[PDB]
Amino acid sequence: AEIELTIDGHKVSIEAGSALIQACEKAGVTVPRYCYHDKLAIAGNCRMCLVDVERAPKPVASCAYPVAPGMVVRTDTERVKQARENVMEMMLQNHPLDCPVCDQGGECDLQDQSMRYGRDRGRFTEITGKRSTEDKNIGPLVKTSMNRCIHCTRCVRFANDIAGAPELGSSGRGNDMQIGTYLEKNLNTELSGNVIDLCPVGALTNKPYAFRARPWELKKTESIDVMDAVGSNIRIDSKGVEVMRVIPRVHEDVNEEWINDKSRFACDGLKTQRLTTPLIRVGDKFVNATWDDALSTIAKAYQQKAPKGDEFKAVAGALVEVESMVALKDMTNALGSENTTTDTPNGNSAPAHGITFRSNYLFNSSIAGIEDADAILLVGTNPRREAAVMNARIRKAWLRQELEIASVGPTLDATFDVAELGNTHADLEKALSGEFGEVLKNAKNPLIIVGSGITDREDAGAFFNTIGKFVESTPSVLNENWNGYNVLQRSASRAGAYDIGFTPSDEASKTTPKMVWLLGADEVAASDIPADAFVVYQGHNGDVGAQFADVVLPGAAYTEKAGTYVNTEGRSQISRAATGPPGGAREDWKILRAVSEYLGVALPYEDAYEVRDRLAEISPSLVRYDLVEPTVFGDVAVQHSLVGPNGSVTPSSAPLTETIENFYMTDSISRSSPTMAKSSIAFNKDNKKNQAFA
Amino acid sequence: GEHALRRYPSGEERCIACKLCEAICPALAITIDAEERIDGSRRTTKYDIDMTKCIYC
């Protein structure tokens, strides 16, 4: 299956049929390029990787010349060095003199490569001068200066292939070729601020902020995103108190160099409406306070209200650390109340699928396993909105192989092609009984995939019954080597809270609390908390959740703490603290550790390594980082998840609603950022610019 | 001898926030804060030379 050949005297063995640029990458030979990318289609536009090949008259393009046996490849021929100087010189003749004002100062691919191979001198000194090709508006997220473009087709190859937004294009012939929409219409895709780290020159860049810091000034920091459930890898760039940008670090399984839009442009909300001091409510107006003032106010109101048990509600929220949840849960259970719930509506009960047997609430086939999938169906979700990188995975699989989608829920617009099935659990059961007991039973590697927007529903258990009974009946969806019951989450914490056991009991759902704890917890309603309750908020910026509070406590956001986070797949991953918490914010678990001292609870740890050991005691797949383990208990877990909700609840005819009303405004940072606040109204698809037609 | 930020004829500040003088200084005297206005042109909100540590190269 492999082929041995020679590059630069080295010998190298690569799989048959590959490109020659992959053999040059494998052997260690540096070959320059402009329009080749590891995740995109092959074009031969840019003409840089010309290479000397024996038995060839001309130098061939190494990105699209396929690998043949007995191959002798030379890269240091004087003809090749002449070729690279020639092509570089051709590239640099009406490219404009913009490097003092360009974005890609120290990060320009064309600029670094005009040193290793480019000519020293430039002859373009013609009178009539440069081409102009005046630019055009795209959207409020992508700054566009098309004079600096070199026409590498990489932006339009991306927006066609993986993003699924075919609006971009190349209109013209010869020198009057332009790239982009020429209706003056709006590029909408849910992963759209991704074309700017893809363009090798500074033509498509950031609109919401002008660049204020040149990339030699920046300090790079390798952290995890917590805004979405995928837990994709980012790269925080900081000048030192402020955070400039995030950029996808590459990961083989989870995100493959692509990052979400909401992941990227919500560093704006990281510096605009934060909490820098504790506040105490006087009555219709807060005042800011001494730290001791607020933290003795909390103890004095605990002694005044005196919740003896099942009256200290402790709700967490969306983007919170595992260690802060461990601190909160320890403080509640040594307090004497496991009224320990999550933020979602219908969060006051157990979420109708087991905290037991981790494969109940995880994404059980791996994220890599979608590439191996055959015919999958989604229930109650829109993967275009929730986990937008997952849709790039779905469309990549559906385009590379032969797949079959059908959908149960609201009528979604995917990039890919769904089949509609219905808006009812009766339509669900009819679809699972009618024609997909042939399709999912026939398929080698299917998977059934579930939103967390059905755990929202109070009729969830009857919706788990049909699907768990089908998985237990069908032996192709559930066997030895892979599990195919799969769910999604919407948070970085709700897939890791259930690792701890962060759930209320059946007794805890019945009482009304006297002292409510908000930890994050941004989507609470005015009806969800009582009127007499002591409602202390702990978060990192001001929100609806902080508006109800009697005491707010400033916490550190995800940038400012080294935290553990668990995705839907089950990967435990650490973030790195890029900067300190600004003004008077502190780390999240240490605040609980000190409020415990003013109560009667002495938490047994005071050090971060002791937090790591206690965190191992809850479950040791959380001190083991970025490993995925299989489960031998998936067969038992589907039956144990089936037995519980059998007959407990009747399936009503409530139609399957959309899980989030907006993508761009959730999770307590995107509400504060003006980038999202104008990007929600610019992409409303009411206007003529977002729509493909008319 | 002592520094000066020049101007254009017809009155214009001429420092385009291009950040080269900060990246070369062998004693790190320059400190520049750069911000862009609505116009699309580039200038400096805060320009700064510490003359205790400028070395006159």
């Binding site: 820098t276 506040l279 409510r281 807060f286 005015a526 109800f548 003004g583 | -």
Partner: peptide, 13 residues
């Protein structure tokens, strides 16, 4: 020609 702290709003009980 050419980390702002959140403003305090306590809502109704």
């Amino acid at each position: 020609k050419w980390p702002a702290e959140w403003t305090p709003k306590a809502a109704v009980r």
